[PDB]
Design a protein around this ligand. Sequence first.
Ligand SMILES: *[C@@H]1O[C@H](CO)[C@@H](O)[C@H](O)[C@H]1NC(C)=O
Ligand SMILES: *[C@@H]1O[C@H](CO)[C@@H](O)[C@H](O)[C@H]1NC(C)=O
Ligand SMILES: *[C@@H]1O[C@H](CO)[C@@H](O)[C@H](O)[C@H]1NC(C)=O
Ligand SMILES: *[C@@H]1O[C@H](CO)[C@@H](O)[C@H](O)[C@H]1NC(C)=O
Ligand SMILES: *[C@@H]1O[C@H](CO)[C@@H](O)[C@H](O)[C@H]1NC(C)=O
Ligand SMILES: *[C@@H]1O[C@H](CO)[C@@H](O)[C@H](O)[C@H]1NC(C)=O
Lengths: 91, 476
Amino acid sequence: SCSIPQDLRDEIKECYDVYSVSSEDRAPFGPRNGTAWIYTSEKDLNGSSHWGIIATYSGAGYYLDLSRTREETAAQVASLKKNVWLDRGTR
Amino acid sequence: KYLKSVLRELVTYLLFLIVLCILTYGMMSSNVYYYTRMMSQLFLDTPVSKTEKTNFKTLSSMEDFWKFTEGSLLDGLYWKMQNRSFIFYENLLLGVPRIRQLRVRNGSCSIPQDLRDEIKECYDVYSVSSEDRAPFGPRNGTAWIYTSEKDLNGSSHWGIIATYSGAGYYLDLSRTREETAAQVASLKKNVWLDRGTRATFIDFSVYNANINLFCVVRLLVEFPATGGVIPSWQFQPLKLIRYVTTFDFFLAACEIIFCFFIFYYVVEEILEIRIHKLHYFRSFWNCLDVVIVVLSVVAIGINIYRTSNVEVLLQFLEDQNTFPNFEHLAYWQIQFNNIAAVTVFFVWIKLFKFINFNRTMSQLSTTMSRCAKDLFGFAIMFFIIFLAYAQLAYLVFGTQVDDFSTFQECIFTQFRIILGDINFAEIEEANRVLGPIYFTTFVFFMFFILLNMFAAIIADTYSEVKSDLAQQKAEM
Ligand SMILES: *[C@@H]1O[C@H](CO)[C@@H](O)[C@H](O)[C@H]1NC(C)=O
Ligand SMILES: *[C@@H]1O[C@H](CO)[C@@H](O)[C@H](O)[C@H]1NC(C)=O
Ligand SMILES: *[C@@H]1O[C@H](CO)[C@@H](O)[C@H](O)[C@H]1NC(C)=O
Ligand SMILES: *[C@@H]1O[C@H](CO)[C@@H](O)[C@H](O)[C@H]1NC(C)=O
Ligand SMILES: *[C@@H]1O[C@H](CO)[C@@H](O)[C@H](O)[C@H]1NC(C)=O
Ligand SMILES: *[C@@H]1O[C@H](CO)[C@@H](O)[C@H](O)[C@H]1NC(C)=O
């Protein structure tokens, strides 16, 4: 997202900039499967801004609804933990 | 007329103030606070080990320093990346850390011959004239050979106890934990920190390429000649690759505009220094102008000198297997911030020269000005007793209280007692009889007997100024 100085561009390989609407990710990742790995627009996702401590986060993003009882909620959470869902890009 | 000149003199000041406000906003972001907080909490809060509950801030023995230097330190430094070492998977540890110590020699002081039969050796307090320069121990590498301050490319530090030099016996740690731990264990096996050591420095740096902003770290442990351990720390968020984004170009343009403005002010002040009036020091609104100009000139000089020499960063970037040397840059950044804060504070204070637009502000300014002389006269008398009390507290309590340790601390604690913050329960055990007598007499005299004089003077002066102003209006 940002620019890396050319002096040490061989050392640092990737940049994950601070959160901003103009620098948000809208691409699939991992084992692409519907709700949990596809970007959903704010208008479709029923959301709104929040104004957290650091910045004002929008209502869009990746989401996954849980289930109604403990067992398969734990199963879904373990699935989201095995397939790494929290990379360095999360904000 | 008398209005066309003041209008220009006000619009130019408003433009200068806007430029300065933009410049000072551009240099003070919000990520640096959290960056420093995470670094400090990672390095100064985690305990030495899982069993011990002592962190770096609570070091109390030389053995605890050895326990800390292998463990929490190595845990913080080297992180197993999923070779290089990213501190939080975000902050890159560039180069290698370096540890060095300063020590003195035996026979530095002289034990009296009366009790020489039991004392064998002594080590005086740290001093440049009485520091060791001879090899000791197994005598292989730089950790056991004295190295001059000029060859180490260092400088002084001004620690809590004294002002240490930049020389000493240093050792560059490795790039991976598996070798740094071995080196530290080797340094611990042979006696490297004996009774003769006086100080120990640990320093490194990180980059955090996400936001182009460095961060230099220095940890200092002081060993006084009377025994004990005194820890210290310092984290400085430097920035050395400034020109990357458009906002940075905007900030450079603002700096150039500020330089033009200060040149114009110095020209227009040296113009009127003699033409309008020679030797005009009774205004206090022109003695502030010279202070503004001098402070700004010093600030630009420091800024142009600091950024002109960044050869250390380049020479490190040629080969990144050596220890970077970023101490001087951090020191000059601290000095620049200290100068800029005072400069902007005086610039803001300068605003009072224009707020006289109606009778209400004019009479308030007249009241404030007319009461300065007698307030200054009484301030000397007040401060004489204030410093007498300070020296009494320093002499009586200044050795068993930890709060009256030095004169400055006595001044500050009396100021805090004026605020009614500091409790009195820590003085009776320090001294049973004179403690509460001191506290009671000080609060009795300074709290209302010598404190309401300022209020009385201000009230009387304001009342008589208002009465005179009302009387002269009706007389006309
Ligand atoms: C990020 O992008 C750069 C080039 O844009 C690429 O070299 C690098 O491998 C990428 N990293 C990841 C984790 O996708
Ligand atoms: C993604 O969905 C497909 C479709 O059934 C499924 O076979 C696959 O197991 C899913 N991915 C994961 C990681 O479960
Ligand atoms: C979200 O809002 C839409 C209206 O566009 C509505 O149809 C839907 O029921 C709401 N909840 C869902 C299905 O996400
Ligand atoms: C330093 O010199 C004194 C004087 O002889 C001696 O007693 C002492 O053992 C010496 N210290 C060491 C560490 O050898
Ligand atoms: C010092 O040098 C000797 C000679 O090479 C070596 O055997 C030894 O391991 C080194 N270190 C110490 C602590 O003696
Ligand atoms: C000190 O001198 C120069 C710094 O300009 C550098 O080339 C040299 O390697 C430095 N020495 C050490 C031990 O850092």
